[PDB]
Amino acid sequence: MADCRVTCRFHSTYRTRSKIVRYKRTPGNRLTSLRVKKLPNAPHCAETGKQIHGIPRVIPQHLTRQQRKVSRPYGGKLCGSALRAHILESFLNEENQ
């Protein structure tokens, strides 16, 4: 068609960060609008601010219990590097102390 202009899909037309769309062609040769949802951040380390490996960027409510866990004693709260320091620090301190 010679015109590809669309109309707003939301209750109002103000374009905030939760009102973003993309365009796709439908089976009836029509151009439609689809929401672009915000992607949440995955959990971040407590000691450092880096991201924790093994967990996807989805809200935890939509994940199974196994998919939001890491198999380590402090898994999901701190990284492997930060856990070594705590183990070394506690042992070396309690040996001298």
Q: Which of residues 27-56 bind Mg ion (CB under 5 A)?
A: 54
Q: How far is the CB of 68 from Mg ion (least distance, A)?
A: 8
Q: Are 52 and 60 in contact (CB under 8 A)?
A: no
The Cα–Cα gap between 82 and 89 comes to 11
- Give bridge partners of residue 24 from the DSSP assignment: 32
Q: Which does 66 bind (CB under 5 to 8 A by kind): Mg ion, RNA, none?
A: RNA
Q: How far is the CB of 85 from RNA (least distance, A)?
A: 12
Window 61 to 80, contacts with RNA (CB under 7 A): 61-62, 64-77, 79-80
The Cα–Cα gap between 22 and 33 comes to 6
